[PDB]
């Protein structure tokens, strides 16, 4: 192969110099080095619970309390998976669903004033990024930019599922208020849940002095 990725014998990097026949051979190899959800996703794919389960069965009951104690909290989860559950490769994301539209409105307020939920922006956030990631991966890019964007891509993906977990993003200045993340809407984290059991409104109700 020409100046570049050229896996030779135990040494695998070849630089060319057509001046004098000098087939440069720098010495690295097929050292699969990955970072980000990738390596994780991979490491999970290549798992066969049945093996790790039995391995800990031994790891557990025999070694000293020390390395056997952890081995148990470790087998507990593995088992749940391995049970009637859903095979554990899906804890990773490669496709984020998208809450409906009318469930995060783009309303008319006071004339020019528009009304929009705090999640549509935590999405545009992603969308733009995810794309940007793609354009630059096409555009052909130096390394320190792919990861850096990949990084930022991570953030946003959490930021939409659940904010503040690592950091608290904010609509551009005016509101230092956090953007309403998903489970937030679930837990009623901002005094929402309570209200949910604080009541709902009956259809044919009344009140008045006794």
């Amino acid at each position: 192969a020409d100046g570049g990725k050229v896996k030779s014998d135990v040494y695998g990097r070849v630089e060319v110099d057509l001046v004098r026949n000098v087939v440069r051979v720098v010495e690295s190899y097929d050292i699969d080095a990955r970072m980000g959800a990738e390596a994780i996703q991979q490491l999970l794919k290549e798992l066969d619970l049945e093996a790790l389960e039995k391995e800990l069965l031994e790891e557990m009951k025999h070694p000293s309390r020390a390395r056997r104690a952890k081995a148990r909290k470790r087998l507990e989860v593995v088992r749940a998976f391995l049970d009637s559950g859903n095979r554990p490769e899906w804890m990773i994301l490669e496709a984020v669903p998208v809450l409906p539209p009318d469930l995060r409105p783009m309303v008319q307020v006071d004339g020019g004033r528009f009304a929009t939920s705090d999640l549509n922006d935590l999405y545009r956030r992603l969308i733009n990024r995810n794309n940007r990631l793609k354009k630059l991966l096409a555009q052909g890019a130096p390394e320190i930019i792919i990861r850096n964007e990949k990084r930022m891509l991570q953030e946003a993906v959490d930021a939409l599922l659940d904010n503040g977990r690592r950091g608290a993003p904010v609509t551009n200045p005016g509101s230092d208020r956090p953007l309403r993340s998903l489970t937030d809407i679930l837990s009623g984290k901002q005094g929402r849940f309570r209200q949910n059991l604080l009541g709902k409104r009956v259809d044919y109700s009344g009140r008045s002095v006794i």
């Binding site: 009637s84 899906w90 804890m91 994301l93 984020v96 669903p97 998208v98 809450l99 409906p100 469930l103 999640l119 939409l160 599922l161 659940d162 998903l182 489970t183 809407i185 679930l186 949910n196 709902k200």
Partner: protein, 48 residues
């Protein structure tokens, strides 16, 4: 018209929950007698 009231459909809070939950990786399905699906959002979630 003078007839008993139709038994309750699904609670918007629920539904809003299920979708507000799928919003996150997770997946909340509803099952019958046998661990097989039951369609709360009737029809709508079928694609196209």
């Amino acid at each position: 018209k003078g007839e008993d009231v139709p038994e309750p459909s699904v609670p918007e809070s629920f539904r809003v929950l299920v979708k507000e939950l799928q919003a996150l990786a997770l997946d909340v399905q509803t099952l019958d007698e046998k661990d097989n699906p039951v369609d709360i959002f009737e029809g709508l979630a079928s694609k196209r």
